[PDB]
Amino acid sequence: AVVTAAGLAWLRQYLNPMGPDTTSVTGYPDGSAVTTCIADYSNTFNVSFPPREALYCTGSSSSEKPTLVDADNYAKIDKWSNYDITLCVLALPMLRNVVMLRLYPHTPTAFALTEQTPNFPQRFPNWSVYSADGTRFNNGDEPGYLQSYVYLPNVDKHLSAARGYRLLSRGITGIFSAPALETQGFVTACQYLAEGSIQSQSIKSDAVRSVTVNSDGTVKNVESSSQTVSSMPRYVFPLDGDNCAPSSLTETYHQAYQSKATDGFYMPVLSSSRDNPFHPPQPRAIAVYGSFLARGCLDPVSEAHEADGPTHDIYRLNVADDVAPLFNTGVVWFEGISPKFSLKLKTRTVLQYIPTSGSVLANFTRHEPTYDQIALDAADRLRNLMPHAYPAAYNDWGWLGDLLDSAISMLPGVGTVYNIAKPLIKPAWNWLGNKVSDFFGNPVARDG
Amino acid sequence: AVVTAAGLAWLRQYLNPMGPDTTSVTGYPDGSAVTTCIADYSNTFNVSFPPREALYCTGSSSSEKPTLVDADNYAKIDKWSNYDITLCVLALPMLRNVVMLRLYPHTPTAFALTEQTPNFPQRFPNWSVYSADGTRFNNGDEPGYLQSYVYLPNVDKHLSAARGYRLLSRGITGIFSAPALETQGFVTACQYLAEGSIQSQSIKSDAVRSVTVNSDGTVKNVESSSQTVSSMPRYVFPLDGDNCAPSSLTETYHQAYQSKATDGFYMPVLSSSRDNPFHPPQPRAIAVYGSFLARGCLDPVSEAHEADGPTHDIYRLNVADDVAPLFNTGVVWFEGISPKFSLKLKTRTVLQYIPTSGSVLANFTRHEPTYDQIALDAADRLRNLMPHAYPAAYNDWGWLGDLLDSAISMLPGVGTVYNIAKPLIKPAWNWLGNKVSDFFGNPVARDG
Amino acid sequence: AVVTAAGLAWLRQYLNPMGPDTTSVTGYPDGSAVTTCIADYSNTFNVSFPPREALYCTGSSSSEKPTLVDADNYAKIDKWSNYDITLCVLALPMLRNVVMLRLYPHTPTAFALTEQTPNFPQRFPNWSVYSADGTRFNNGDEPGYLQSYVYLPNVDKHLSAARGYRLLSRGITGIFSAPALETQGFVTACQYLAEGSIQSQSIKSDAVRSVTVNSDGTVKNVESSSQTVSSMPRYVFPLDGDNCAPSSLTETYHQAYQSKATDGFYMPVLSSSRDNPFHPPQPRAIAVYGSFLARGCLDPVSEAHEADGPTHDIYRLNVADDVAPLFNTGVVWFEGISPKFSLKLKTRTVLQYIPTSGSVLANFTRHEPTYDQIALDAADRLRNLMPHAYPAAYNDWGWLGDLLDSAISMLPGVGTVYNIAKPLIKPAWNWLGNKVSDFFGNPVARDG
Amino acid sequence: QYIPTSGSVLANFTRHEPTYDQIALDAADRLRNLMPHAYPAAYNDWGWLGDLLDSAISMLPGVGTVYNIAKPLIKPAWNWLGNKVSDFFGNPVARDG
Amino acid sequence: QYIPTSGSVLANFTRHEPTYDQIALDAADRLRNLMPHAYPAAYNDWGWLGDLLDSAISMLPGVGTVYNIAKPLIKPAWNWLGNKVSDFFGNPVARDG
């Protein structure tokens, strides 16, 4: 009838993963009655304009031979560094490979993805180049953008030795800095559910064509093996790359966060469901849904045109991982950024494990099978009205917890004891104009 | 603690889509906090016995060459027109192709479906013929039935330009008319959940057989490529065609609607779940599950008989669409209908969109992120006790809303303020015998 | 506002399927408003050490020729019978093939499964031998263990003639007996959700290699058909075979049951969800997920190494069935058992059907569309705190129903009438030490 | 606003709200001659608008007035160059950007 | 206890509980000289420990005491060979194994 302490702690760490008060770590309040070990991974990365030494090509040049550095095509990327640039970060719900960084000479119209599988995608300190025409880059082409994955190795090590897992919370902080008189730029951030699933794309086989012209050998096996079959199963994400441009995200989602570049960002990615069950680690190749070209059976056609129906393009990422289901995909854009910028990415990922017998995690187990329906219902309440992101320095929200959680905890059903906690009003998160008001109307003076 | 106005409006439009009072259009009460545009499609079609000009063949005759009219096999269909006929309408949850019309010389024992993919399925004004032996029809065969799809083009246009969608409500009205002294016939209607999913059927490849008899060429590649693989993924519906006969539906479902033909029908198709999340438009080829023939591994067998296990037949519809998940499939039968009938089909489909930037829908957005748990719980309450259909003229139900919704709104939990609203009794929808009583025992005198 | 009688009856039969008081049979309290027929299957089997006549080989020896008895390799199994043995029972949610029995010379480190598909898996009275090296057994090998499936034929007959089905409850009782002075041994039991799904493994095709050396025939079709495709779809269970050892299960799950062998076991398998919808009978080949070997795209690799990514091994069971989704998988181990033991397996499976018109089930229908939200919420409450198993003789629990169900029925929301029913404390199910206390602290003196 | 043509796209987004309000139109005619032609780009969500400015101006039109007095109205001074901005009721406007 | 090194495995299992308790440390220093060096293998879950022994010893340290008297403490006799074992408060210890 009242929210417990463990439920409140879980709610605070779920909504504010990188808050200063979040020191203790608590599990999901479902009373699973299983031996669990909760792991907290805090990582920091300093991303700036990469040098030539950490830049590789994804084209067919690096097909069999391993990663190849740029053959001093770095002059074009220096030309990029002449003017302002754009920096996209894309946080898919993958456990390792927490975010994908991408660098553009200028803001693109869409989050494009190469149709051919890239060769040797690079972890964060190294980058991989992609051409301007939306294809993989070989030496001598025109570079279009740079891409890298921010990888957590300890997550991989611990996921190997676990019966099951579930993501408890994840937050990404974007401390931005630039030289004086070069602080111009804008930051946008948005979360939305891209519910991926295990799917296989439709591919075609090859028909054999043998013409035996021998006097006794005249088989002439002209059989048509060119039928339509299913490819290897992959975990495909329905992220709308064509609608991932910053302006579309701002005008589509009301909780999207916009501010000046110097404010940075702080995205506490949120789950889209109220139940968070354990899952066995099942890494798979990740892919992203594209769009279809041939209408196929979308119009009255014949049998032969059934096969080439609305088959959506699947973009292989050449990255294997197991994803946290029902968790939002985040995307932030830094537009018009000075090329000599500096972004301190600080990611906190807290997730629960069921240890395997004889594994390392078995030495850190913790028996807290606490249960709290009120906390879960409050999270389901709050999911639809929290902002998608906050300024990087906006931690330790006063309204959270003793007011916001308390105010939202008595709507669920009528399971309420205290008559009235506090009236709740619609906040206005206008960081660009310095007219920010919280959920209770109290103003937010700038703390940074 | 009390149902809001928006929740009541959504509930009324969800349960009575074609009610006269449903003028305003309201979104799903979940407080999605997204920019949405709600589109209402009202369409009217006059279906009667088709002439020869609008009748095409689905057989291999129209394989490469486009649709072929009947080569004056129309005499047999005129012979159909000599006696009474049967008219089935099947409303699958497909967004476009709202219903499938089918014309039979007499009531079939099951809703059969051709094993081979039909050639050029026809939109409503045109029809396609299928043979009497459950196969596709070429000229010179014996026609078994006629089939057509009722297509909504504006739905396709708007679905192209949308990040996401969800079906809000759908209703189908069946105004029936016939010449005087030819009003005999019966109408049956039933809704049931056919939860489709993306599945691929099991097919076989072709083994190459090359016999090189040359003096130096004696390779003899006899390799067996004839293995079992997966076909193209399709959205498959588990509709029980073998159990779709009118009598079985009447004796299986208590809420099934039965009446005289002149009463018509009015089916407000209902969702089977309480959550209606947005989904990205992902059109796919539609198919229907059949039944298996070879038991396979249902009995102790060897390895070689693993492949030919219980593989269910999949009937390709040669139609591509994206379906509304968790929505009931409706089916109505008009049995013993005079051949010179006239059915006015009136379909109302209201569904929500997330507009894409720069699209047409962006000019009609409407920001109403209202939330109402009571309305959703009331819908979950009511799903299991509303009739599957009503007579075509039975709109503007008095019991709905201020009594039925109010009576059902205080069961959910104990979140109740008003002590007692109105006692609820079991209705008796006996339209055949004119002994209809509503949910509160009040009689229903015939209004048409 | 109060739990009905039908809801209480369903809850009692769901939590205590084999209780003495469970005489009447009641359906799921969801008010489906469908014609249903509830079938109760009670079966008894006497499993002991099999004789040579009922022992077959799974290897390639019995590939085309049917099941082959052991060519008097039974001396090694007699050597097994010299010392103590181990007996595992694995209750997957398959409707028929209720349990899988397995006999080991000594406790294994994991629940291994053969990589090659076994030939002719045997129903319970017969067994099939598997080698000690985790491979199928031919005559002359080293036997590793024996395996059999306990099959219910009436379930198959009734599932054939049904539109839909759902499992209502399932319980397995393990009455254990042994000769005097040979009662040593231990019993362990554990339930956990292994949420299976329809998946297809990644396989490879065969590239054709034709070398035409004729003077005019010089085609040289060297085309590479060796691409990666999807195999036949199968229902795959993510049961952790590597973590199914008894000790790991005991140390992982708090509700796992441990006792002496003579106590037997009684596992009332429980659902993992609160909704139990009807499903059409769709038998499929069953398989079990293994583990992957090649990391593949888990590390930065090229395009050619995308295919051999983290592809998990899929172990075909060569058994076709339709499973009850969202139901727990049970596993019990009898360790250190005297070889001349005797286990009376008593399985009770109660499940609901929607009869097909003209079928046998249509003669036993029963119209009880009762609805009870409180009972379902109470089941969701209780799922996480009931023991996974009880001693075989521990039926008719006093605490159940008028106390435990009543005590748990007033937590859900605040939909509560009676002020306080009874305080609930944490039970201690220490059957090994005879210090068992129930949910209310009352001791449990040994009744057997 | 549009009047949709039959069979056009707009016909799928119609909305029947034939509401009438003479007071609002008269208030707009009142206010046209005293609102500033422009504001700083960040000066949205004016506090004085609506519950004060519209209310203050809504009782001048004719004598169709119910509430005796809403709020006195004074002449604002929109001096953005010198940071001496005062709204229609004399309250100062501190710089929000 | 460990202080994890950055990037090590232990860093994934840290736990922030900087609790401080002088009374517990003083009680341990109190108790070190009067606990038996060993017990029978089956003699776990001592009844006297904690709510009596720790409580009885927790009010000797200094005079930082709130509760007037917890329980008198007497000299135990751990004679396991002769089955005449008495705990710190004189209660006998019947053989549990």
Side-chain angles (χ1 to χ4, degrees):
Chain A
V2 60
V3 48
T4 91
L8 257 206
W10 166 81
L11 197 54
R12 295 177 72 86
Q13 93 160 355
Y14 165 67
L15 296 177
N16 194 7
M18 320 205 43
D21 34 316
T22 62
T23 61
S24 66
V25 183
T26 165
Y28 194 70
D30 64 340
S32 285
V34 199
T35 295
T36 54
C37 159
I38 321 179
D40 161 278
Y41 310 89
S42 304
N43 294 91
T44 307
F45 311 87
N46 308 301
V47 32
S48 60
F49 208 88
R52 184 197 89 78
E53 281 50 54
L55 260 175
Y56 301 90
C57 328
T58 44
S60 69
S61 191
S62 189
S63 53
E64 301 65 47
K65 179 84 181 58
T67 83
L68 320 163
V69 289
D70 292 359
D72 204 77
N73 290 163
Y74 193 69
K76 309 155 177 181
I77 305 141
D78 262 342
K79 289 174 66 64
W80 293 9
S81 75
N82 275 349
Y83 333 101
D84 291 3
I85 52 155
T86 298
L87 166 76
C88 166
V89 343
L90 170 70
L92 282 173
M94 314 184 274
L95 292 193
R96 53 193 93 90
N97 307 291
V98 47
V99 311
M100 205 192 306
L101 305 175
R102 198 172 271 201
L103 263 188
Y104 286 98
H106 41 49
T107 310
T109 60
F111 193 88
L113 217 49
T114 168
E115 185 259 7
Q116 304 283 318
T117 317
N119 276 307
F120 297 90
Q122 304 293 322
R123 329 280 216 199
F124 151 67
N126 316 327
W127 303 66
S128 62
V129 194
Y130 294 81
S131 320
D133 52 10
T135 61
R136 302 171 298 164
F137 177 87
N138 306 270
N139 272 301
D141 292 16
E142 184 67 29
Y145 58 92
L146 319 173
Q147 197 196 245
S148 95
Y149 294 89
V150 168
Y151 184 76
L152 314 180
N154 286 325
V155 173
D156 189 9
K157 283 155 203 178
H158 295 168
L159 266 171
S160 289
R163 305 191 34 141
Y165 74 93
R166 60 175 163 197
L167 184 57
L168 285 191
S169 95
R170 163 168 281 176
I172 303 137
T173 312
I175 305 285
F176 181 87
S177 72
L181 330 179
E182 284 198 76
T183 61
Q184 35 65 22
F186 296 94
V187 58
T188 299
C190 172
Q191 298 178 30
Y192 59 92
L193 173 68
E195 166 178 340
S197 50
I198 296 164
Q199 297 299 328
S200 49
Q201 63 172 343
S202 161
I203 60 175
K204 295 181 184 294
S205 294
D206 39 356
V208 304
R209 295 293 172 270
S210 48
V211 198
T212 44
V213 79
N214 208 70
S215 66
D216 41 347
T218 166
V219 173
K220 181 68 176 186
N221 187 23
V222 78
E223 86 202 0
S224 176
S225 302
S226 162
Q227 51 179 165
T228 286
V229 297
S230 290
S231 89
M232 179 195 36
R234 286 179 203 97
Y235 199 92
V236 199
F237 277 113
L239 96 95
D240 279 57
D242 302 334
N243 317 128
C244 260
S247 58
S248 66
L249 293 172
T250 62
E251 73 190 36
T252 294
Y253 294 91
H254 300 156
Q255 313 284 5
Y257 154 83
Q258 305 182 74
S259 177
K260 283 187 314 307
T262 78
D263 276 10
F265 74 94
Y266 162 48
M267 187 155 51
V269 314
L270 304 174
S271 176
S272 84
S273 170
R274 48 154 321 100
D275 42 274
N276 191 33
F278 278 104
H279 286 318
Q282 285 267 323
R284 289 177 186 277
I286 308 301
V288 169
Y289 260 131
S291 80
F292 67 96
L293 192 34
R295 287 184 63 81
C297 36
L298 271 170
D299 308 324
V301 297
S302 61
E303 294 189 60
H305 297 81
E306 174 85 355
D308 56 354
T311 64
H312 297 72
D313 306 334
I314 276 184
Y315 301 130
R316 276 85 60 195
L317 290 193
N318 205 347
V319 166
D321 203 343
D322 37 2
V323 317
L326 310 161
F327 259 76
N328 286 358
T329 288
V331 40
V332 343
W333 292 90
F334 284 84
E335 316 145 76
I337 290 324
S338 78
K340 50 183 68 65
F341 73 108
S342 143
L343 189 85
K344 185 176 290 295
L345 258 193
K346 315 220 315 294
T347 85
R348 200 204 177 207
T349 295
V350 48
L351 48 55
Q352 215 169 2
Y353 292 121
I354 299 178
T356 290
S357 65
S359 76
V360 281
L361 307 183
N363 298 131
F364 303 119
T365 75
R366 222 58 39 104
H367 302 285
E368 50 269 4
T370 76
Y371 185 49
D372 192 358
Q373 260 304 320
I374 308 301
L376 309 183
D377 297 14
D380 205 354
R381 262 311 316 181
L382 291 168
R383 169 180 57 248
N384 259 343
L385 36 79
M386 320 273 321
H388 287 167
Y390 313 84
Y394 192 52
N395 299 329
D396 49 73
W397 321 316
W399 36 272
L400 175 73
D402 38 4
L403 318 86
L404 181 54
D405 300 341
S406 296
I408 216 67
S409 305
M410 49 41 62
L411 301 319
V414 82
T416 297
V417 178
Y418 197 28
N419 203 5
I420 178 66
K422 196 146 162 53
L424 179 55
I425 83 170
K426 211 55 47 213
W429 310 97
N430 191 294
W431 305 103
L432 268 162
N434 293 109
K435 314 231 154 303
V436 213
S437 120
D438 54 47
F439 290 89
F440 306 103
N442 310 115
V444 185
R446 192 56 263 156
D447 318 306
Chain B
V2 60
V3 48
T4 91
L8 257 206
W10 166 81
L11 197 54
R12 294 177 72 86
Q13 93 160 355
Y14 165 67
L15 296 177
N16 194 7
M18 320 205 43
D21 34 316
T22 62
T23 61
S24 66
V25 183
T26 166
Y28 194 70
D30 64 340
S32 285
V34 199
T35 295
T36 54
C37 159
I38 321 179
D40 161 278
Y41 310 89
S42 304
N43 294 91
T44 307
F45 311 87
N46 308 302
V47 31
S48 60
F49 208 88
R52 184 197 89 78
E53 281 50 54
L55 260 175
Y56 300 90
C57 328
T58 45
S60 69
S61 191
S62 189
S63 53
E64 301 65 47
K65 179 84 180 58
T67 84
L68 320 163
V69 289
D70 292 359
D72 204 77
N73 290 163
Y74 193 69
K76 309 155 177 181
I77 305 141
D78 262 342
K79 289 174 66 64
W80 293 9
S81 75
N82 275 349
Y83 333 101
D84 291 3
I85 52 155
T86 298
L87 166 76
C88 166
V89 343
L90 170 70
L92 282 173
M94 313 184 275
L95 292 193
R96 53 193 93 90
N97 307 291
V98 47
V99 311
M100 205 192 306
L101 305 175
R102 198 172 271 201
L103 263 188
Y104 286 98
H106 41 49
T107 310
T109 60
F111 193 88
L113 217 49
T114 168
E115 185 259 7
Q116 304 283 318
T117 317
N119 276 307
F120 297 90
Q122 304 293 322
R123 329 280 216 199
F124 151 67
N126 316 327
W127 303 66
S128 62
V129 194
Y130 293 81
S131 320
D133 52 10
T135 61
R136 302 171 298 164
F137 177 87
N138 306 270
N139 272 300
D141 292 16
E142 183 67 29
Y145 58 92
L146 319 173
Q147 197 196 245
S148 95
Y149 294 89
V150 168
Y151 184 76
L152 314 180
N154 286 325
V155 173
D156 189 9
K157 283 155 203 178
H158 295 168
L159 266 171
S160 289
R163 305 191 34 141
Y165 74 92
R166 60 175 163 197
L167 184 57
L168 285 191
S169 96
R170 163 168 281 176
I172 302 137
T173 312
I175 305 285
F176 181 87
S177 72
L181 330 179
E182 284 198 76
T183 61
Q184 35 65 22
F186 296 94
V187 58
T188 299
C190 172
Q191 298 178 30
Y192 60 92
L193 173 68
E195 166 178 340
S197 50
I198 297 164
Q199 297 299 328
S200 49
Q201 63 172 343
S202 161
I203 60 175
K204 295 182 184 294
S205 294
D206 40 356
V208 304
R209 295 293 172 270
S210 48
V211 198
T212 44
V213 79
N214 208 70
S215 66
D216 41 347
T218 166
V219 173
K220 181 68 176 186
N221 187 23
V222 78
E223 86 202 0
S224 177
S225 303
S226 162
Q227 51 179 346
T228 286
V229 297
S230 290
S231 89
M232 179 195 36
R234 285 179 203 97
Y235 199 93
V236 199
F237 277 113
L239 96 95
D240 279 57
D242 302 334
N243 317 128
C244 260
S247 58
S248 66
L249 293 172
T250 62
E251 73 190 36
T252 294
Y253 294 91
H254 300 156
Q255 313 284 5
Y257 154 83
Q258 305 182 74
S259 177
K260 283 187 314 308
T262 78
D263 276 10
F265 74 94
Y266 162 48
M267 187 155 51
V269 314
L270 304 174
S271 176
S272 84
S273 170
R274 48 154 321 100
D275 42 274
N276 191 34
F278 278 104
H279 286 318
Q282 285 267 323
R284 289 177 186 277
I286 308 301
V288 169
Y289 260 131
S291 79
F292 67 96
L293 192 34
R295 287 184 63 81
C297 36
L298 271 170
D299 309 324
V301 297
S302 61
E303 294 189 60
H305 297 81
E306 174 85 355
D308 56 354
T311 63
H312 297 72
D313 305 334
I314 276 184
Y315 301 130
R316 276 85 60 195
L317 290 193
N318 205 347
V319 166
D321 203 343
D322 37 2
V323 317
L326 310 161
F327 259 76
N328 286 357
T329 288
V331 40
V332 343
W333 292 90
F334 284 84
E335 316 145 76
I337 290 324
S338 78
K340 50 183 68 65
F341 73 108
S342 143
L343 189 85
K344 185 176 290 295
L345 258 193
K346 315 220 315 294
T347 85
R348 200 204 178 207
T349 295
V350 48
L351 48 55
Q352 215 169 2
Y353 292 121
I354 299 178
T356 290
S357 65
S359 77
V360 281
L361 307 183
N363 298 131
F364 303 119
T365 75
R366 222 58 39 104
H367 302 286
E368 50 269 4
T370 76
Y371 185 49
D372 192 358
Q373 260 304 320
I374 308 301
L376 309 183
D377 297 14
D380 205 354
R381 262 311 316 181
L382 291 168
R383 169 180 57 248
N384 259 343
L385 36 79
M386 320 274 321
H388 287 167
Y390 313 84
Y394 192 52
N395 299 329
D396 49 73
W397 321 316
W399 36 272
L400 175 73
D402 38 4
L403 318 86
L404 181 54
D405 300 341
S406 296
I408 216 67
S409 305
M410 49 41 62
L411 301 319
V414 82
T416 297
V417 178
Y418 197 28
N419 203 5
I420 178 66
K422 196 146 162 53
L424 179 55
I425 83 170
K426 211 55 46 213
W429 310 97
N430 191 294
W431 305 103
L432 268 162
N434 293 110
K435 314 231 154 303
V436 213
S437 120
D438 54 47
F439 290 89
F440 306 103
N442 310 115
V444 185
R446 191 56 263 156
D447 318 306
Chain C
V2 60
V3 48
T4 91
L8 257 206
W10 166 81
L11 197 54
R12 294 177 72 86
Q13 93 160 355
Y14 165 67
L15 296 177
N16 194 7
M18 320 205 43
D21 34 316
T22 62
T23 61
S24 66
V25 183
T26 166
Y28 194 70
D30 64 340
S32 285
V34 199
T35 295
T36 54
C37 159
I38 321 179
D40 161 278
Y41 310 89
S42 304
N43 294 91
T44 307
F45 311 87
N46 308 301
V47 32
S48 60
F49 208 88
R52 185 197 89 78
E53 281 50 54
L55 260 175
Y56 301 90
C57 328
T58 44
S60 69
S61 191
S62 189
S63 53
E64 301 65 47
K65 179 84 180 58
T67 84
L68 320 163
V69 289
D70 292 359
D72 204 77
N73 290 163
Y74 193 69
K76 309 155 177 180
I77 305 141
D78 262 342
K79 289 174 66 64
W80 293 9
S81 75
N82 275 349
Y83 333 101
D84 291 3
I85 52 155
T86 298
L87 166 76
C88 166
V89 343
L90 170 70
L92 282 173
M94 314 184 274
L95 292 193
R96 53 193 93 90
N97 307 291
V98 47
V99 311
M100 205 192 306
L101 305 175
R102 198 172 271 201
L103 263 188
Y104 285 98
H106 41 49
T107 310
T109 60
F111 193 88
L113 217 49
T114 168
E115 185 259 7
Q116 304 283 318
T117 317
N119 276 307
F120 297 90
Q122 304 293 322
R123 329 280 216 199
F124 151 67
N126 316 327
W127 303 66
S128 62
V129 194
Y130 294 81
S131 320
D133 52 10
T135 61
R136 302 171 298 164
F137 177 87
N138 306 270
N139 272 300
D141 292 16
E142 183 67 29
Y145 58 92
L146 319 173
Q147 197 196 245
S148 95
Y149 294 89
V150 168
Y151 184 76
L152 314 180
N154 286 324
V155 173
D156 189 9
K157 283 155 203 178
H158 295 168
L159 266 171
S160 289
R163 305 191 34 141
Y165 74 92
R166 60 175 163 197
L167 184 57
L168 285 191
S169 95
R170 163 168 281 176
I172 303 137
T173 312
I175 304 285
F176 181 87
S177 72
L181 330 179
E182 284 198 76
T183 61
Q184 35 65 22
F186 296 94
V187 58
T188 299
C190 172
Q191 298 178 30
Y192 60 92
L193 173 68
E195 166 178 340
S197 50
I198 296 164
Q199 297 299 328
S200 48
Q201 63 172 343
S202 161
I203 60 175
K204 295 182 184 294
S205 294
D206 39 356
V208 304
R209 295 293 171 270
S210 48
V211 198
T212 44
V213 79
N214 208 70
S215 66
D216 41 347
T218 166
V219 173
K220 181 68 176 186
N221 187 23
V222 78
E223 87 202 0
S224 177
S225 302
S226 162
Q227 51 179 345
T228 286
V229 297
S230 290
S231 89
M232 179 195 36
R234 286 179 203 97
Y235 199 93
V236 199
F237 277 113
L239 96 95
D240 279 57
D242 302 334
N243 317 128
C244 260
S247 58
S248 66
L249 293 172
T250 62
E251 73 190 36
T252 294
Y253 294 91
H254 300 156
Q255 313 284 5
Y257 154 83
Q258 305 182 74
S259 177
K260 283 187 314 308
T262 78
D263 276 10
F265 74 94
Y266 162 48
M267 187 155 51
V269 314
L270 304 174
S271 176
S272 84
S273 170
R274 48 154 320 100
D275 42 274
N276 191 34
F278 278 104
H279 286 318
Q282 285 267 323
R284 289 177 186 277
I286 308 301
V288 169
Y289 260 131
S291 79
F292 67 96
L293 192 34
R295 287 184 63 81
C297 36
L298 271 170
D299 308 324
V301 297
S302 61
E303 294 189 60
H305 297 81
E306 174 85 355
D308 56 354
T311 63
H312 297 72
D313 306 334
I314 276 183
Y315 301 130
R316 276 85 61 195
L317 290 193
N318 205 347
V319 166
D321 203 343
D322 37 2
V323 317
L326 310 162
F327 259 76
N328 286 358
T329 288
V331 41
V332 343
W333 292 90
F334 284 84
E335 316 145 76
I337 290 324
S338 78
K340 50 183 68 65
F341 73 108
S342 143
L343 189 85
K344 185 176 290 295
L345 258 193
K346 315 220 315 294
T347 85
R348 200 204 177 207
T349 295
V350 48
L351 48 55
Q352 215 169 2
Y353 292 121
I354 299 178
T356 290
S357 65
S359 77
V360 281
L361 307 183
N363 298 131
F364 303 118
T365 75
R366 222 58 39 104
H367 302 285
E368 50 269 4
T370 76
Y371 185 49
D372 192 358
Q373 260 304 320
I374 308 301
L376 309 183
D377 297 14
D380 205 354
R381 262 311 316 181
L382 291 168
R383 169 180 57 248
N384 259 343
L385 36 79
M386 320 273 321
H388 287 167
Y390 313 84
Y394 192 52
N395 299 329
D396 49 73
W397 322 316
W399 37 272
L400 175 73
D402 38 4
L403 318 86
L404 181 54
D405 300 341
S406 297
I408 216 67
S409 305
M410 49 41 62
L411 301 319
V414 82
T416 297
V417 178
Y418 197 28
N419 203 5
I420 178 66
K422 196 146 162 53
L424 179 55
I425 83 170
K426 211 55 46 213
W429 310 97
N430 191 294
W431 305 103
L432 268 161
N434 293 109
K435 314 231 154 303
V436 213
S437 120
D438 54 47
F439 290 89
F440 306 103
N442 310 115
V444 185
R446 191 56 263 156
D447 318 306
Chain D
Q1 215 169 2
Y2 292 121
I3 299 178
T5 290
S6 65
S8 76
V9 281
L10 307 183
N12 298 131
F13 303 119
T14 75
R15 222 58 39 104
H16 302 285
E17 50 269 4
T19 76
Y20 185 49
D21 192 358
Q22 260 304 320
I23 308 301
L25 309 183
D26 297 14
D29 205 354
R30 262 311 316 181
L31 291 168
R32 169 180 57 248
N33 259 343
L34 36 79
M35 320 273 321
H37 287 167
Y39 313 84
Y43 192 52
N44 299 329
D45 49 73
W46 321 316
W48 36 272
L49 175 73
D51 38 4
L52 318 86
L53 181 54
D54 300 341
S55 296
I57 216 67
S58 305
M59 49 41 62
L60 301 319
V63 82
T65 297
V66 178
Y67 197 28
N68 203 5
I69 178 66
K71 196 146 162 53
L73 179 55
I74 83 170
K75 211 55 47 213
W78 310 97
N79 191 294
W80 305 103
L81 268 161
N83 293 109
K84 314 231 154 303
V85 213
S86 120
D87 54 47
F88 290 89
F89 306 103
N91 310 115
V93 185
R95 192 56 263 156
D96 318 306
Chain E
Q1 215 169 2
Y2 292 121
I3 299 178
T5 290
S6 65
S8 77
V9 281
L10 307 183
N12 298 131
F13 303 119
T14 75
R15 222 58 39 104
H16 302 286
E17 50 269 4
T19 76
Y20 185 49
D21 192 358
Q22 260 304 320
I23 308 301
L25 309 183
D26 297 14
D29 205 354
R30 262 311 316 181
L31 291 168
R32 169 180 57 248
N33 259 343
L34 36 79
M35 320 274 321
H37 287 167
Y39 313 84
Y43 192 52
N44 299 329
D45 49 73
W46 321 316
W48 36 272
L49 175 73
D51 38 4
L52 318 86
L53 181 54
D54 300 341
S55 296
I57 216 67
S58 305
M59 49 41 62
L60 301 319
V63 82
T65 297
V66 178
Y67 197 28
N68 203 5
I69 178 66
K71 196 146 162 53
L73 179 55
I74 83 170
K75 211 55 46 213
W78 310 97
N79 191 294
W80 305 103
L81 268 162
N83 293 110
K84 314 231 154 303
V85 213
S86 120
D87 54 47
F88 290 89
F89 306 103
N91 310 115
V93 185
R95 191 56 263 156
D96 318 306

